[PDB]
Write an enzyme that holds these catalytic residues in place. Structure first.
Site, mmCIF file in Angstrom:
data_model
loop_
_atom_site.group_PDB
_atom_site.id
_atom_site.type_symbol
_atom_site.label_atom_id
_atom_site.label_comp_id
_atom_site.label_asym_id
_atom_site.label_seq_id
_atom_site.Cartn_x
_atom_site.Cartn_y
_atom_site.Cartn_z
ATOM 1 N N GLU A 1 -24.647 22.573 -27.977
ATOM 2 C CA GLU A 1 -25.203 23.212 -29.156
ATOM 3 C C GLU A 1 -26.647 23.625 -28.903
ATOM 4 O O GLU A 1 -27.040 24.751 -29.222
ATOM 5 C CB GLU A 1 -25.172 22.263 -30.351
ATOM 6 C CG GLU A 1 -23.806 22.036 -30.954
ATOM 7 C CD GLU A 1 -23.203 23.298 -31.531
ATOM 8 O OE1 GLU A 1 -23.962 24.247 -31.815
ATOM 9 O OE2 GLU A 1 -21.965 23.331 -31.713
ATOM 10 N N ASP B 1 -29.095 28.437 -37.123
ATOM 11 C CA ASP B 1 -28.890 27.034 -36.774
ATOM 12 C C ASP B 1 -30.200 26.458 -36.257
ATOM 13 O O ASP B 1 -30.920 27.106 -35.500
ATOM 14 C CB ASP B 1 -27.786 26.902 -35.741
ATOM 15 C CG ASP B 1 -26.446 27.282 -36.303
ATOM 16 O OD1 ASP B 1 -26.144 26.828 -37.423
ATOM 17 O OD2 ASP B 1 -25.700 28.026 -35.635
#
Length: 120
Positions: A32, A50
């Site tokens: 991620e 994000d």
């Protein structure tokens, strides 16, 4: 800041993350954010972004505007700090609800065995 594979496992354990989910967490983070606490993803189809180490979406979790966010009660900028205490409690909050299904990185790169955490 950027953790090493072992520097990260150390932190997660210190942060109280569940040991049997450990290899999954390590995998998730590495796919991620590549272990960077200040990383900020590029805009997704929906104007959402994000943030940080856990790449937490600003749609339902953190506030984009100075005042403490939504479900995690924090500002997204708080999820970009070197100290990850705030991001962790939030990341846990998310798992308690949607497991890892929230993170596409995990759904894509963590379905066939993770790294081994002992050596850390």
């Amino acid at each position: 800041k950027r953790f090493t594979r072992c520097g990260l496992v150390n932190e997660l354990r210190k942060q109280g993350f569940d040991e049997n989910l450990m290899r999954d967490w390590v995998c998730l983070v590495e796919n991620e954010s590549a272990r960077y606490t200040d990383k900020i993803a590029n805009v997704n189809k929906n104007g959402s972004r994000d943030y940080g180490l856990f790449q937490i979406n600003d749609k339902y979790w953190c506030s984009k505007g100075s005042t403490p966010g939504k479900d995690c009660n924090v500002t997204c900028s708080q999820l970009l700090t070197d100290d990850i205490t705030v991001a962790s409690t939030c990341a846990k909050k998310i798992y308690k609800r949607t497991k890892f299904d929230a993170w596409s990185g995990w759904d894509n790169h963590c379905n066939h065995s993770n790294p081994d955490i002992s050596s850390c």
